[PDB]
Amino acid sequence: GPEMVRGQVFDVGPRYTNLSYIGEGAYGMVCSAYDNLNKVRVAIKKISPFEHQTYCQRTLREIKILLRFRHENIIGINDIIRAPTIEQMKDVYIVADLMETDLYKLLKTQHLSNDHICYFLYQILRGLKYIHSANVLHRDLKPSNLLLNTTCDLKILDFGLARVADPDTEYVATRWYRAPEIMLNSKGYTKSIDIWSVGCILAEMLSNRPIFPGKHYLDQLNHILGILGSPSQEDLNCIINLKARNYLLSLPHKNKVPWNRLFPNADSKALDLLDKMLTFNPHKRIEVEQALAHPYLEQYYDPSDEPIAEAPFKFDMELDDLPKEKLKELIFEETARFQPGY
Ligand SMILES: Cc1cc(-c2nn(C(C)C)c3ncnc(N)c23)cc2ccc(OCc3ccccc3)nc12
């Protein structure tokens, strides 16, 4: 029979053995396992989406994007296991490189020196540069979506909320990393929403504490304005939405808090870059290639070793809202090339 982990079956043998609980991912339980073919311990995520439309849809979408993307700072799929007939397939197991932890857990437990911060930040933007080059917005960068290994290699996870970057909410664990414009007008304008999310992660690395921990929807904007200050007139004039602009004008005045008051031990170049990432106005916010070229990342900056996508990625939006059972069939087809062959 199959091995079991906290009452959950992991029918991944004979190739993968000696399973052990790591944690809960956003889509299912994650265990570590020994790969008997490559002689190495790997991470295996178990996914059970076929009891709902939204899970099947997001599963199919994630498998397609991670299979097309190939970059060292973005999580890759090494293998996929499922039953040989669609009628048996009640679960899907995705296999990936074993890392040590996520940035969420690391920051709850330990200090990061400037070199670790600097190197982690470089890798987030390196990976993000590839994603944005494919015309994709992540829209949910946060510490829990960043995996680290023991040699400080960093990988980005979770394109569940990813979209094309052209002009066009639900439940999420945290709004602490959402850019202000997302709640002030068009639903996540541009690539600057991700740069905002990365700035928030930088701040959190400097202090081990999230910078904008809103306790509810409107509170999130109060946290942001309480540090950045009230928007200037120029910045106010970039808020296109009538109600948003009015709402901003109705709020109490707040003065800017200097960065070196919040982060008194931080490298002044780090705070300079942070200032440019956490700019209220998304049109003035620093872009990924410019951020990589900031003096703070001079040690690692190397545009010959910062690859871009071969082409733009396209999401087939019509597959969304297809019937539960049809999505099950497409996931069977997409996972077929990992089934023992030839
Ligand atoms: C997002 C994600 C995280 C982890 C993971 N999560 N964790 C911890 C944070 C629980 C890890 N620790 C060490 N190594 C790891 N690989 C992990 C394993 C994963 C293993 C497979 C995987 O497949 C991506 C995927 C494919 C299809 C649908 C949804 C997700 N995604 C994983």
Helix/strand/coil for 17: strand
What residues have CB less than 8 Å from 144, skipping those under 6 apart?
Answer: 102, 103, 104, 173
User: What φ, ψ does residue 112 adopt, rounded to 5°?
Assistant: -115, 125
Q: Per-residue DSSP letters for 50-85?
A: TT-HHHHHHHHHHHHHHHH---TTB----EEE--SS
Ligand 1 center–CA 77 separation, angstroms: 9
Experimental method: X-ray
Q: Determine phi and psi for 83, rounding to 5 degrees.
A: -60, 150
* Sign of the torsion angle spanned by Cα atoms 313, 316, 321, 324: negative
In the chain, CATH 1.10.510.10 covers 99-322
Ranges in the chain annotated CATH 3.30.200.20: 1-98+323-342
Q: Which two tokens mark 297?
A: 């990342």
Which residues contact ligand 1 via a Cβ below 6 A? 22-23, 25, 27, 30, 43, 45, 47, 59, 62-63, 66, 75, 94, 96, 98-99, 102, 147, 157-158
Of 1, 5, 61, 3, the residue nearest 28 (C-alpha):
5
Which two three-digit tokens encode residue 276? 């440019």
140 flagged as catalytic = yes
- Say if CB 91 and CB 46 are below 8 A apart: yes
Residue 82: C-alpha distances to residues 25, 76, 94, 116, 249 (Å): 19, 18, 9, 38, 55
CA distance 59 to 122: 29
Instruction: Output b/e per residue, 266-279; b: 16+ Cβ within 10 A.
Output: beeebbebbebbbb
Please check if 100 is assigned to a binding site.
no
Token readout for 169 is 């909410």
User: 199 and 274 in contact (C-beta within 8 Å)?
Assistant: yes
DSSP 277-330: HS-SSTTTSPPHHHHHTSGGGTTT--GGGS---SS-----GGGTT--HHHHHHH
Q: Which CATH number fits domain 1-98+323-342: 2.30.110.10, 3.40.640.10, 1.10.1740.10, 3.30.200.20?
A: 3.30.200.20
> What angle is formed at CA 130 by the lines to CA 42 and CA 100, rounded to 5 degrees?
25
For residue 308, which phi and psi values (nearest 5 degrees)? -120, 165
Buried b (16+ CB within 10 A) or exposed e, 191-218: bbbbbbbbbbbbbbbbeeebbbebeeee
DSSP code at position 258? P
The CB density around residue 250, as the number of other CB atoms within 10 Å, is 7
> Distance (Å, rounded) from C-alpha 262 to C-alpha 207?
9
Residue whose C-alpha is closest to residue 104's, from 43, 147, 149, 152 = 147
Closest CA to 81 of 23, 2, 146, 24: 2
Ligand 1 closest atom vs CA 27: 29
Query: Which helix H or strand E contains 270, and what residues bound it?
Result: helix 268-277
Q: Which conformational region is residue 175 in: left (phi greater than 0), alpha (psi within -120 to 50 degrees), or beta?
A: alpha
Does the domain made of 99-322 have the CATH classification 3.90.190.20? Answer: no
**Residue 251 DSSP SS3:** coil
| Residue 76 · residue 96 · CB < 8 Å | yes
- How many angstroms separate the CA atoms of 265 and 155, rounded? 27
Residue 22 φ/ψ, nearest 5 degrees? -110, -50
What Å resolution does this PDB entry report?
A: 2.2
Query: What is the distance between the alpha carbons of residues 128 and 199, in angstroms, rounded to a whole number?
Result: 13
Distance 141 CA to ligand 1 centre (A): 15
Q: Which two tokens stand for residue 310?
A: 């071969």
